[PDB]
Design a protein around this ligand. Structure first.
Ligand SMILES: O=C(COP(=O)(O)O)[C@@H](O)[C@@H](O)[C@H](O)COP(=O)(O)O
Ligand SMILES: [Ca+2]
Ligand SMILES: [Ca+2]
Ligand SMILES: [Cl-]
Lengths: 325, 325
């Protein structure tokens, strides 16, 4: 609620007129798998670092900040636009699929202090959370986030907590079965991690509905009327007093934009986005198949078009965090 | 080197006249194993927590503070004397004997915040450190301690870091081979974790020599003259500007105490001790074999004698931490 002077200065460096128009590219495992769909060989470290730098160079002139990973993204962080702020990811990528606990784990040789020393204006951490899951697992997860929030307090650096929801007993979070419980998963997790003890400054969250099953957006089965969907957005806005920003979860650029419009019309007062794949996903194929110059031209044309159309939508949908602090 | 008002206040609650005369009893597996020797059945949680409470009730009137573990020791913490402060252990016990890395790990449902909420005036964490070991292993350890130091800064609670040294290639730290390098291990590790970035308020460390190989204290081979050992203590004193206190584990009560005398004589300005095993060990056989009433009587009589002998030696050897400002 009350930002320290340094935390506020950092929030300002990440945003424009209270809106976070951030580019997300801390993907590692998720990126590797995209690359592996066009590549016979294993993608190299140089390839991963290069595409990250290409996205940074070409697109951060159009974002208020960029989120990168320390593993492959530090060269990319240094060629970002002068006007763009920096977030660094702090969690190890992915989860163990042989169990349902998805426990969080910080990068082995990092700390919040180190992230700040590396030039970041925010620490980002991704937590998988099932509000209905095993209570002891969740106890361990809450303790873990308490520690990170305390680090960020001490180092006086904003804590961006990303929450990705799941159900221990539903395999596919794109299924109709998950869509029926998504709003509950998202909104109740936001309520938990908005407690003061967790030290969060900004929540990076999913929209509380799977729009593919909403009337007017759906191409197949319809699970929700527009009014029911709108209510999920209002319930989400009522689930936190913190700034919150949306992730794209890799839907099309157009569906993500249309979702932002719907969210605003419904009453969500979201404060921006940390948007990755919806913007740059198409560059992966070009980069692998046609190389870096071809990917650079893609970024300068299609990439720009995506981020520019996104920015125009944000301009008319997002609300400033400087009305919540 | 500068304490906040709360950190200072907490340090004062852990000390008497700037000397730490703290009773260590955060043993978990080790305490269970001692008990397992004197009965057939598996020692229960009730038994373990009762013995900690007996020791706490009967001996903390004579200690400046007591170190307990959150696993078995919270009930004991609440019956400590009102004159005695509280430290709680934050680390998981032991290390994997398969590997040489001895990596640290916090207790899974704890945080510095939760340790403070449980009434502690300090967070205690044990780290195993080989200054000459794998440098990536050591970067991971250093990052880990940075996180903990940052938590404790945020929660405004003193951070007591215990360092136990080892060598990746020497199996027995009682060997002559380890004795020859112990001063190097201990003192260099103190130089590392005295750096401001680790946030340490008090170091809990080994004496920098194995007195069993020192002239006049050895009953077998002599590796060191009294003058060389004296120099090792002075090198230790010059390895940090933080308060530091000695741990025992490894030697008899009498030898530890004679070592305190030798330490002071040599020019060490150590600020106290965190030692528990020598003082209460005899109560364990008594508690299992004659019940809680007998144990209480053991603690009142033999137990008091033990801790009083130690306190009398501390009065002649330890220097105040207040002096280190
Ligand atoms: C935000 C969302 O971006 P998007 O708009 O793509 O959902 C990103 O930090 C995360 O979601 C992250 O990239 C997931 O990473 P990995 O699982 O580690 O590969
Ligand atoms: Ca609790
Ligand atoms: Ca709200
Ligand atoms: Cl133990």
């Amino acid at each position: 609620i009350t930002l320290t002077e340094n935390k506020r200065k950092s929030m300002e460096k990440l945003s424009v007129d209270g809106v976070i128009s951030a580019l997300a590219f801390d993907q590692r495992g998720a990126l590797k798998r995209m690359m592996a769909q066009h590549q016979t060989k294993e993608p190299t470290v140089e390839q991963i670092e290069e595409l990250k730098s290409l996205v940074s160079e070409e697109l951060t002139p159009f974002a208020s900040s960029i989120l990168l990973d320390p593993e492959y993204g530090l060269p990319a962080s240094r060629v970002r636009s002068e006007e763009a702020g920096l977030l660094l990811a702090y969690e190890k990528t992915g989860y163990d699929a042989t169990t349902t606990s998805r426990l969080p784990d910080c990068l082995d040789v990092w700390s919040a202090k180190r992230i700040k020393e590396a030039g970041a204006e925010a620490v980002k951490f991704l937590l998988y959370y099932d509000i209905d899951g095993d209570q002891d697992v969740n106890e361990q997860k809450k303790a873990y986030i308490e520690r990170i929030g305390s680090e960020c307090r001490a180092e006086d650096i904003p804590f961006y907590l990303e929450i990705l929801t799941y159900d221990e007993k539903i395999a596919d979070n794109a299924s109709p079965e998950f869509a029926k419980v998504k709003a509950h998963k998202v909104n109740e997790a936001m309520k938990v991690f908005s407690k003061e003890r967790f030290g969060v400054d900004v929540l990076k969250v999913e929209v509380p509905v799977n729009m593919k099953f909403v009337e007017g957006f759906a191409d197949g089965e319809v699970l929700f009327t527009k009014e029911e969907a709108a209510q999920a957005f209002r319930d989400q806005e009522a689930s936190t007093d913190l700034p919150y920003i949306y992730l794209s979860a890799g839907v099309s650029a157009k569906l993500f934009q249309d979702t932002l419009v719907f969210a605003a019309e419904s009453g969500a007062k979201f404060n921006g986005v940390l948007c990755g794949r919806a913007t740059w996903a198409g560059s992966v194929k070009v980069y692998i198949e046609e190389g870096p110059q071809a990917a650079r031209e893609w970024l300068r044309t299609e990439g720009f078009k995506n981020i520019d159309e996104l920015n125009k939508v944000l301009d008319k949908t997002a609300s400033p965090w400087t009305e919540k602090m």
